[PDB]
Ligand binder design. Sequence first.
Ligand SMILES: CC[C@@H](Cc1c(I)cc(I)c(O)c1I)C(=O)O
Ligand SMILES: CC[C@@H](Cc1c(I)cc(I)c(O)c1I)C(=O)O
Ligand SMILES: CC[C@@H](Cc1c(I)cc(I)c(O)c1I)C(=O)O
Ligand SMILES: CC[C@@H](Cc1c(I)cc(I)c(O)c1I)C(=O)O
Length: 569
Amino acid sequence: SEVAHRFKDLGEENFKALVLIAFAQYLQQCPFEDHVKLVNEVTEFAKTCVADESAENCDKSLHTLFGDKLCTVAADCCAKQEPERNECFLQHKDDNPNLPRLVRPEVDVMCTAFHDNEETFLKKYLYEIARRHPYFYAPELLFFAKRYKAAFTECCQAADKAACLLPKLDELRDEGKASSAKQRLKCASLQKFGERAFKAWAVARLSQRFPKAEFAEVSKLVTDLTKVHTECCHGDLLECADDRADLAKYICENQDSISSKLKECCEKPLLEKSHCIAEVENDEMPADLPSLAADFVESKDVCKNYAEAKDVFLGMFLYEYARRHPDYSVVLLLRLAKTYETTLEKCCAAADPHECYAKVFDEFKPLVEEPQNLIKQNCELFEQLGEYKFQNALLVRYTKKVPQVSTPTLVEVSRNLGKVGSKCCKHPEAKRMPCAEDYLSVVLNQLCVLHEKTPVSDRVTKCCTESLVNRRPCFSALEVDETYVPKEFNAETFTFHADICTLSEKERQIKKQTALVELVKHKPKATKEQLKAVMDDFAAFVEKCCKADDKETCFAEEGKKLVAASQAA
Ligand SMILES: CC[C@@H](Cc1c(I)cc(I)c(O)c1I)C(=O)O
Ligand SMILES: CC[C@@H](Cc1c(I)cc(I)c(O)c1I)C(=O)O
Ligand SMILES: CC[C@@H](Cc1c(I)cc(I)c(O)c1I)C(=O)O
Ligand SMILES: CC[C@@H](Cc1c(I)cc(I)c(O)c1I)C(=O)O
């Protein structure tokens, strides 16, 4: 009885939550009520399996159980059986579900609902989250749930609940969206590029983090993590949550053989412990570490070792190069690994290989500097314009690259691409590349998945498909789509109403940004100057209507003066 196994290990709480998360991510459209029913129903059945391990169906598997459950409230997916049926659910996971933006009422009401029904209040949380992020790292979502409870606990007992809650909640929202995106990458990596890609990625990341840990150690960790994330990404949340616990235990047990900064983490409760490790800063770099050239360039036994065990040898190279380069991004370390392999392929087949792969590090030079210079450039640019103007530049640039992409997607992705400026440019050159280029891997992966649903640009498709590691370079190389035929103007697209006078300031900028995109799509050839020339005028167009009492008309009357000058430029 698998159900019993998981129940005993995780307890009633986590089990309940994890099961809720699972259902919400599968049937994101079904309402909260229908889900809680199914959860309790499954939980009650789970209990009759812990002691009575031979009760009917306790022998069955988690998919069969969960599947038969969901199919009682859904249609073609339920027409299938094992494997088939399950996978059918996974393929129908929506990354951009048409769901009503989650608004949160006055501080007073939420506290009443929380103090009144606390268990339901938190369940409602997981459900609304899990359904808008079908690939959320489940075990981590539990950690956030706790902090969510801890926020209301304190703040609902304060003089000014508002000034206490709102911040803690804004900070949770962000940290949550960031976590969701990091995970979504892990899943895309596994599903779209396979176990090898993810493993290589994990080895580089872990090598950097745990430069003192031996290769055999890192490799053992990578293998476990793969299992965990394979399970989480496929919906095996119970098995994931369990295995993740096992791993975190193993890591705190072998602290000495891994990292000297796990001390803090291993003293905390499970949830806090797991979250602590995944965020632990890199360990110190071992003192006297030999030059990489000795074993991977100068040695005359290279092509032999490469032939003997390619994947192990290259793995060793990556582990060895990453551990001594925390200043390099993970994707860069991989580019170097691909470049190294490719060279061995060529050279090991030649007459004198040793002098074929003699000047290999000279091939790295260009790959190392490209990121460095682009970083340096875009930071100084960012420093002179600020986050807002900087986002605009990216809006215009990326809209020129791939005009076919939907405006909502462009605005989101660009805005996110711009946040890299504030996140990373503050750091010293030493920690810049990891922060920057890896964060862009996540943002670009967002663009890819959202595109994958409804493809409209082969340039997005290409850059998204042919290499995970080269995604960013591939995109930077793009300039202007020359085959793109500009779209004509649509009245409804350039109609500024008074409703924009109640939106926040951010909500207003996002409307001024959504417009800029539509403009570029109409005149891609237009110049950065001519655009700013009208962009400035767009600000004036609205700094009037909302300031003309008792005239809803303004939106149209002034809108005429707007479009008029618009068609001009
Ligand atoms: C800004 C919307 C977020 C959802 C979200 C999250 I994640 C965590 C908390 I706390 C929230 O209040 C909210 I709203 C998203 O759609 O990514
Ligand atoms: C290397 C994988 C993760 C970090 C990580 C680690 I190290 C340990 C546990 I347990 C986790 O759940 C996670 I996520 C990353 O670097 O993105
Ligand atoms: C480095 C120059 C910018 C160009 C640019 C563009 I295109 C549109 C607007 I509006 C701008 O303010 C700017 I500066 C870029 O290519 O990233
Ligand atoms: C040319 C810059 C790259 C992306 C990039 C990089 I690399 C570093 C920083 I700092 C950024 O803000 C950004 I945007 C691109 O847009 O193609």
